[PDB]
Write a protein that binds this ligand. Sequence first.
Ligand SMILES: O=C(OC[C@H](C1CCNCC1)n1c(-c2ccccc2)nc2ccccc21)C1CCN(c2nc3ccccc3n2Cc2ccccc2)CC1
Length: 141
Amino acid sequence: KDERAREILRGFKLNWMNLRDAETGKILWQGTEDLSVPGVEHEARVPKKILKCKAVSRELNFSSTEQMEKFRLEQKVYFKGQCLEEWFFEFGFVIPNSTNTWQSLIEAMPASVLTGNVIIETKFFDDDLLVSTSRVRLFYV
Ligand SMILES: O=C(OC[C@H](C1CCNCC1)n1c(-c2ccccc2)nc2ccccc21)C1CCN(c2nc3ccccc3n2Cc2ccccc2)CC1
């Protein structure tokens, strides 16, 4: 059960990801490093104009050796320790040993005040079950 969360973490990998202006479909940020690895504070530099898109599109590519009934995400935006927004997204069923693209739409203080002060804390779940908790500190450039 906490053992099951541990196997799912073991078999999981986020292979690549990007963030797009939903209005134009232009890539604003992409990376192939697994930002959802727990135990370390990740960092990401994004263009300051991403804050001006009302709709941001995300593509997440991941592999999973374990099956999952209801793979989903809870994401919290923290500015200097205070939670400002919460986002929920759901993938659902994941086939064991599969690789999957998951597309999500994310929808609607200046850059210079936010930059370095925002942590996006992401929790992965199989249903009620918490697989991992990770952090990215954001810089806006
Ligand atoms: O912070 C968010 O909410 C959106 C908000 C938007 C402003 C534009 N209009 C609609 C909402 N936002 C904000 C934001 C932060 C504070 C106040 C206002 C806006 N900063 C953003 C930076 C990049 C993209 C969106 C950002 C996204 C940021 C990216 N994100 C995310 N999903 C992940 C999945 C796996 C691992 C990491 C994940 N992240 C964090 C992340 C952060 C930067 C680069 C890559 C990833 C989901 C939540």
